[PDB]
From a paper:
ADC catalyzes the oxidative decarboxylation of l-aspartate to yield β-alanine. β-Alanine is required for the biosynthesis of pantothenate (vitamin B5)18 which is then further converted to the important metabolic cofactor, Coenzyme A.17 ADC contains a covalently linked protein-derived pyruvoyl cofactor which forms a Schiff base with the substrate to initiate the decarboxylation reaction. This protein-derived cofactor is formed via the post-translational cleavage of the ADC zymogen protein backbone into α and β chains, resulting in the formation of a new C-terminus on the α chain and a N-terminal pyruvoyl cofactor on the β chain. The α C-terminus is extremely flexible, and the initial binding of the substrate is associated with its rearrangement to close over the active site. This conformational rearrangement is believed to play a role in determining the overall rate of catalysis.21d-serine is an inhibitor of ADC that, like the substrate l-aspartate binds in the enzyme active site.
We have determined the structure of ADC in the presence of the d-serined-serine ligand using X-ray diffraction. As in the apo-ADC structure, the liganded ADC tetramer is formed by a crystallographic two-fold, with two ADC monomers in the asymmetric units. As in the apo structure, a fraction of mis-processed ADC is present, where the backbone of the zymogen is cleaved, but the β subunit has an N-terminal serine instead of a pyruvate. This mis-processed form is present at ≈40% occupancy. The d-serine molecule adopts two conformations in both subunits of the asymmetric unit. One conformer (60% occupancy) forms hydrogen bonds with the main chain of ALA-75, the side-chains of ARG-54 and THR-57, and the pyruvoyl carbonyl (ESI†) adopting a similar binding conformation to the native substrate l-aspartate. The second conformer (40% occupancy) forms hydrogen bonds with the side-chains of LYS-9 and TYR-58 (ESI†) and with the nitrogen atom of the mis-processed β N-terminal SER-25. The degree of “openness” is not the same in the two ADC subunits of the asymmetric unit. There is a significant change in the conformation of the α C-terminal loop of chain A (subunit 1) which shows a displacement of 4.3 Å of the Cα of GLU-23 from its position in the apo structure and a clear change in the conformation of its side-chain (bottom). However, for chain D (subunit 2), the structural change is relatively small with a Cα–Cα distance of only 0.8 Å for the same residue, although d-serine is bound in both subunits (top).
Author numbering:
A (entry chain AAA), F (entry chain AAA): -2 to 23
B (entry chain BBB), C (entry chain EaE), E (entry chain BBB), G (entry chain EaE): 25 to 118
D (entry chain DDD), H (entry chain DDD): 0 to 24
Write the structure that this text describes.
């Protein structure tokens, strides 16, 4: 009841490489 | 929006349609979008729509999701981290 | 703010006075504001006050809102997406 | 007790019709 | 951090130490900080620390706070708006 | 229980003028 | 990330893996990352990976974390503030 | 049911001691 709520790192992909970029994605 | 191999989403505990932060190690750009599931085993990281202005093919990025929880749970919380090298080859440790 | 045709707000489940993210496909700019209702059927997307520095008439944008919920519900959550082309003509899915 | 931030909804590729720097509202 | 006349905080329902967004109408800069109470009747808007890089004396700004609530409460929610002119003279309406 | 939570404009100061800027605030 | 002397984390109530905002007083840059613990007594502030694009050695920064709570509690809430000068020497208040 | 976002804490005017672009953690 009225607990103070933290924002915490849930998870991460560390140093993944971008494979595709699509400006016109629908 | 950012399409991510479902295997990668599983390892990082990231859900389809979850808010994500992308931190571009290559060009220093930082932006917030949401996760789309790509085919399992595709090893896809696709930056779609306006986000294509912030990252290019070959850029090294960190993709992070954040959750909220009470302080006591936060103090023993262990984030789900996946480490990558080479052809988006995933490992459990650095 | 950003004033949006109430028909568009209805389709996307975005509320008057709700926090929204605007991602500019034309110029790559990304900013956060709140939604205002424009007249139903007007097909208006109006960038008001400081936000006028981040978008020009004719720019193509994606407007998103985010909600929080427990992990158990988040796993099956389904966003409300409206698709557009031409002069803000909403494609048949609503 | 883990709360997720999820996409609620989006308007995909709408065009800006008006820009009003001096808006009062 | 941003020091704000306590009368202005009262009118907008903003609390001391609350997260605030500042949208600079003059230069288009957008940043997030927190509210500090200035003396009641001072009509002070003071941009302190790193935020002094984003606003100058004479700049016209919007200062907004956001709260979270369930959807039903959100659908009838009325934000607390204070309108300003001249020597930071406050009014209830535009 | 598991209510979907919205982020809503609580309030705003519309077109207030900056009166002071202090880089070296302590 | 940002690695921070555990003594500093203790004083400010910032947790390992907590979301933090970094506001750069030197160059005006503002970004969001998460906190890592550095060795107790080291007086280290280390900007790691993509964040290295936003701060240089010697830059003066403010590091902040934010929490949510109901309005009733927020009205009397008291942030945990640590003050520094020289080579990350924490001023007597802890 | 109105939830506020509040400053939890801050480190005021610390100096960056190290910058590591190639960090693995």
């Amino acid at each position: 009841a009225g607990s103070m709520i933290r924002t915490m790192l849930q998870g991460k992909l560390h140093r993944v490489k971008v494979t595709h970029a699509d400006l016109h994605y629908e | 929006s950012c399409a991510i191999d479902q295997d990668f989403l599983d390892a990082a505990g990231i859900l389809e349609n979850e808010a994500i932060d992308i931190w571009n190690v290559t060009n220093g750009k930082r932006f917030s979008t949401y996760a789309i599931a790509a085919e399992r085993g595709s090893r896809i990281i696709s930056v779609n729509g306006a986000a294509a202005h912030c990252a290019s093919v070959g850029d090294i990025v960190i993709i992070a999701s954040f959750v909220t929880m009470p302080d006591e749970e936060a103090r023993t919380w262990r984030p789900n981290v996946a480490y990558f090298e080479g052809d988006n080859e995933m490992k459990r440790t650095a």
